[PDB]
Amino acid sequence: STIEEQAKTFLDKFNHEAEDLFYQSSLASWNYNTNITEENVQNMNNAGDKWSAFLKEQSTLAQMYPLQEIQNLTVKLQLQALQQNGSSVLSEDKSKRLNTILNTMSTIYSTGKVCNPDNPQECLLLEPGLNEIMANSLDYNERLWAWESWRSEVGKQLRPLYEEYVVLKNEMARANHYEDYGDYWRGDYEVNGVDGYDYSRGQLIEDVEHTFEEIKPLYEHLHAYVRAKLMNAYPSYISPIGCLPAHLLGDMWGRFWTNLYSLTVPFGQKPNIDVTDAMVDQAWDAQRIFKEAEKFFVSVGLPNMTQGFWENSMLTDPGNVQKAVCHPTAWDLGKGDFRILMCTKVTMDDFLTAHHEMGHIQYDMAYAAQPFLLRNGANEGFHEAVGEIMSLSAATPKHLKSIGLLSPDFQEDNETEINFLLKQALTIVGTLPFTYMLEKWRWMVFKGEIPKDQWMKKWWEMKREIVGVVEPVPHDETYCDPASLFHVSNDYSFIRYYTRTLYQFQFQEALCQAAKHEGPLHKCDISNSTEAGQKLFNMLRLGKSEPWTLALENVVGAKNMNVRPLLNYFEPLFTWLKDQNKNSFVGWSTDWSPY
Amino acid sequence: DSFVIRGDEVRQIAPGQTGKIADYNYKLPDDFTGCVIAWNSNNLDSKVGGNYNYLYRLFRKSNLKPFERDISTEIYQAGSTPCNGVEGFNCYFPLQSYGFQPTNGVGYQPYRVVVLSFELLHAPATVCGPKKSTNLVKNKCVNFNFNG
Numbered sequence: 242s243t244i245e246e247q248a249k250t251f252l253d254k255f256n257h258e259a260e261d262l263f264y265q266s267s268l269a270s271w272n273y274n275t276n277i278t279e280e281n282v283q284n285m286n287n288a289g290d291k292w293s294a295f296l297k298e299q300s301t302l303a304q305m306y307p308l309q310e311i312q313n314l315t316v317k318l319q320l321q322a323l324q325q326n327g328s329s330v331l332s333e334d335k336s337k338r339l340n341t342i343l344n345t346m347s348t349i350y351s352t353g354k355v356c357n358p359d360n361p362q363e364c365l366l367l368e369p370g371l372n373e374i375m376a377n378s379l380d381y382n383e384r385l386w387a388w389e390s391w392r393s394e395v396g397k398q399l400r401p402l403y404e405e406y407v408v409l410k411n412e413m414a415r416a417n418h419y420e421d422y423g424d425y426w427r428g429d430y431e432v433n434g435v436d437g438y439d440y441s442r443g444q445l446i447e448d449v450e451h452t453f454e455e456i457k458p459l460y461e462h463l464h465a466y467v468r469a470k471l472m473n474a475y476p477s478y479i480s481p482i483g484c485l486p487a488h489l490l491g492d493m494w495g496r497f498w499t500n501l502y503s504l505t506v507p508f509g510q511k512p513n514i515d516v517t518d519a520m521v522d523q524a525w526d527a528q529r530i531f532k533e534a535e536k537f538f539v540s541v542g543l544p545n546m547t548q549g550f551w552e553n554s555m556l557t558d559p560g561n562v563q564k565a566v567c568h569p570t571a572w573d574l575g576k577g578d579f580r581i582l583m584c585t586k587v588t589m590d591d592f593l594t595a596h597h598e599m600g601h602i603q604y605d606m607a608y609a610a611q612p613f614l615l616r617n618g619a620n621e622g623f624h625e626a627v628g629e630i631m632s633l634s635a636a637t638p639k640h641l642k643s644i645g646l647l648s649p650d651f652q653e654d655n656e657t658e659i660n661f662l663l664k665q666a667l668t669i670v671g672t673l674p675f676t677y678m679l680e681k682w683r684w685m686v687f688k689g690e691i692p693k694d695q696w697m698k699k700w701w702e703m704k705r706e707i708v709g710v711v712e713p714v715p716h717d718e719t720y721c722d723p724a725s726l727f728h729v730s731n732d733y734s735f736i737r738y739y740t741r742t743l744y745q746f747q748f749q750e751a752l753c754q755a756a757k758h759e760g761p762l763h764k765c766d767i768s769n770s771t772e773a774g775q776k777l778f779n780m781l782r783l784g785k786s787e788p789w790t791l792a793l794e795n796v797v798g799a800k801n802m803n804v805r806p807l808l809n810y811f812e813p814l815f816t817w818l819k820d821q822n823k824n825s826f827v828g829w830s831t832d833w834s835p836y
Numbered sequence: 837d838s839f840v841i842r843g844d845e846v847r848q849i850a851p852g853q854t855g856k857i858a859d860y861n862y863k864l865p866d867d868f869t870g871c872v873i874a875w876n877s878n879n880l881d882s883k884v885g886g887n888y889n890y891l892y893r894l895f896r897k898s899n900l901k902p903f904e905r906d907i908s909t910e911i912y913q914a915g916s917t918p919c920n921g922v923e924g925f926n927c928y929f930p931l932q933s934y935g936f937q938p939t940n941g942v943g944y945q946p947y948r949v950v951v952l953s954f955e956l957l958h959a960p961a962t963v964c965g966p967k968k969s970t971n972l973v974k975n976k977c978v979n980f981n982f983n984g
């Protein structure tokens with residue numbers, strides 16, 4: 242008779258119908274990805290349209306239920322997650338215009354070509370040409386030309402599209418009782434109705450700024466070291482006082498500094514830990530890789546894999562007759578079925594990727610004990626963190642020598658340790674200031690603190706002040722440089738990467754402290770630690786039913802994210818960088834420019 | 837009592853258990869004397885495209901009594917608004933169909949479960965156990981037992 246009973250009945254009906262509907266949709270998507278043809282695409286499109294129509298109908302039906310009269314936290318969270326009427330509050334014409342803008346931006350970013358000025362008969366594409374030039378090429382002029390072409394041929398075409406997209410998103414957010422679109426994105430981190438575990442929206446920004454201010458010295462030392470190393474390859478291109486150029490960061494946008502490992506290697510006389518030869522001489526295969534991963538996961542304390550996972554997944558390339566996408570993705574069918582789509586080859590990188598995918602599948606099976614609206618992680622960065630902690634624990638030399646890949650007589654030299662720490666730094670922390678700057682710029686452009694005639698101006702100001710990157714040539718208001726990224730041109734959040742970067746180190750420190758292991762954090766192994774496995778499963782079981790702060794306090798002991806694990810993980814690397822930067826000038830100055 | 841149930845709810849058919857099936861579909865008494873038998877039937881009750889031939893009562897106004905059937909198809913009135921034999925707001929159908937696909941893992945596969953209920957009354961015992969028989973022996977002092 243009460244509203245709560247009707248809400249529970251509606252939630253049961255939804256968990257009955259939408260479960261099977263999403264299961265059929267995921268089966269269609271799996272048949273399309275594992276078999277590209279003209280019928281699977283139509284089946285997947287029909288399934289997606291039916292699923293979207295069903296979600297719209299269920300949301301319009303649930304909107305007639307008040308949220309203030311519900312006293313159950315689970316029912317309230319499910320109703321809040323179900324009543325998300327984002328793309329339906331605006332007018333039909335405005336919605337069609339926003340969809341057209343999204344589609345044309347996606348087509349411009351994907352189908353974006355640029356031709357050489359001296360060879361008009363052959364043009365260069367993004368993936369084969371631009372990434373190759375920004376990664377494996379060392380010529381200053383070639384990289385500068387490629388960066389300028391990528392920022393001009395695509396950036397200028399997206400200026401009015403982005404100017405209309407930001408306004409449409411702000412209007413949609415104001416229609417959904419939000420302040421701005423950045424506020425709508427931060428609302429995913431908002432949790433209410435629990436005493437002591439509440440988390441506002443500005444508190445997220447405050448915590449991110451505090452963590453960035455605490456991690457600033459390590460990034461400054463790393464940037465100084467990278468600049469000192471790059472001054473050798475570029476004698477008259479980079480100054481020892483100014484910031485690094487934008488097209489000399491090993492990436493099209495300067496996000497990841499992994500490609501700069503060949504130039505910033507601490508000790509080039511000792512090669513990195515590579516077990517590829519030891520893996521190919523022992524007659525390994527993808528099946529053996531997944532078996533060893535399952536053995537590791539069951540030694541940690543997690544259950545085995547389902548029989549369907551072994552009798553239905555495609556762990557190897559089918560061949561040339563059947564076409565499939567070779568992108569590692571974790572598939573959650575919903576009805577107790579879990580598969581992995583990955584063209585797994587014999588490689589240590591593929592080994593870590595398989596461990597990451599198996600950790601994703603383990604998290605899926607862990608939260609599968611909850612309703613459909615709750616079958617998800619506590620936040621948009623928990624899944625990636627749980628995968629990355631396993632990928633890091635599997636890449637330790639102790640685990641490699643215990644499996645059988647690394648020889649037991651191999652000694653642990655500190656030079657290889659410093660090289661591995663520098664690689665991990667360049668691949669993890671190198672994108673944290675860029676992520677923070679991009680997220681703050683998007684938040685301030687959605688809230689309205691940045692005038693329309695100062696977008697790129699303030700963007701470059703922040704990229705030179707906050708980050709150690711300076712633009713080579715001046716770009717006026719027509720070169721929309723920020724819109725040249727995939728996550729910004731396809732309506733995807735970016736703070737999730739910073740959150741998962743914090744969460745992975747927090748989880749690593751927690752599981753290493755619970756494993757009764759002493760020494761460095763990067764050389765910590767949790768393979769035969771059942772206590773850490775149980776403590777992690779206690780958090781993976783909560784899923785989305787409990788707030789993320791409670792899950793954190795259950796897994797690490799704190800209700801707020803901290804950057805101290807990240808600093809403790811690179812403490813020997815921090816000491817080495819401080820010892821190697823005695824004569825170098827730590828920091829950067831915003832007055833220098835390559836103009 | 838033979839019926840098909842989902843794998844993740846097999847243990848609900850037991851004395852002193854609750855849930856959705858043990859309350860709205862089939863309930864056993866607390867003093868039930870018998871054996872519960874179940875086996876996997878994924879090779880027969882599952883077909884490609886979805887086997888929607890089996891249904892279950894999801895909504896009901898009250899719990900069922902031990903050994904009681906309910907074949908009613910009345911629309912479950914979940915609210916104060918009277919349902920005029922049609923579905924809608926606070927008007928849901930009580931019977932819902934199962935989704936049986938051959939790619940489902942353990943828990944969602946169909947499990948055929950039968951219930952053998954033993955009843956003892958004042959009537960003479962008609963069903964007993966198979967009485968074993970031994971070989972004969974002659975010219976030896978041996979105890980015997982034929983009928984009584």
Ligand SMILES: *[C@@H]1O[C@H](CO)[C@@H](O[C@@H]2O[C@H](CO)[C@@H](O)[C@H](O)[C@H]2NC(C)=O)[C@H](O)[C@H]1NC(C)=O
Nearest residue numbers: 249252312313314315316317611612854855856
């Ligand atoms: C919200 O409703 C759920 C039911 O959907 C409650 O979960 C029940 O909790 C009790 C006590 O822990 C269990 O005995 C039941 O089996 C649970 N029902 C399930 C799992 O379906 C939950 O407790 C309610 N929330 C609050 C705060 O009372």
Ligand SMILES: *[C@@H]1O[C@H](CO)[C@@H](O[C@@H]2O[C@H](CO)[C@@H](O)[C@H](O)[C@H]2NC(C)=O)[C@H](O)[C@H]1NC(C)=O
Nearest residue numbers: 537540639640641642643644766767768769770
């Ligand atoms: C975790 O426990 C397993 C099982 O006890 C260990 O595997 C054994 O390691 C010893 C030491 O080299 C070998 O002699 C045994 O043959 C291994 N067992 C098997 C079945 O192969 C393992 O070393 C422990 N540590 C880790 C990190 O896995």
Ligand SMILES: *[C@@H]1O[C@H](CO)[C@@H](O)[C@H](O)[C@H]1NC(C)=O
Nearest residue numbers: 275276277278279280559563
């Ligand atoms: C992939 O799809 C084609 C077209 O329907 C079909 O002929 C082929 O058998 C499929 N391959 C597999 C492995 O199912």
Ligand SMILES: *[C@@H]1O[C@H](CO)[C@@H](O)[C@H](O)[C@H]1NC(C)=O
Nearest residue numbers: 304324325326329330331417
């Ligand atoms: C969207 O949902 C909110 C509550 O979640 C509601 O107030 C609003 O009216 C809905 N929009 C429309 C167009 O009905």
Ligand SMILES: *[C@@H]1O[C@H](CO)[C@@H](O)[C@H](O)[C@H]1NC(C)=O
Nearest residue numbers: 535536539542543544545546
């Ligand atoms: C996983 O499988 C191994 C051997 O196949 C077995 O020893 C272990 O008990 C299993 N773990 C389970 C079922 O949780």
Ligand SMILES: *[C@@H]1O[C@H](CO)[C@@H](O)[C@H](O)[C@H]1NC(C)=O
Nearest residue numbers: 507654655656659813817820
């Ligand atoms: C590595 O260890 C050796 C021997 O202990 C020492 O001489 C060397 O200075 C160490 N290097 C670093 C970077 O700590």
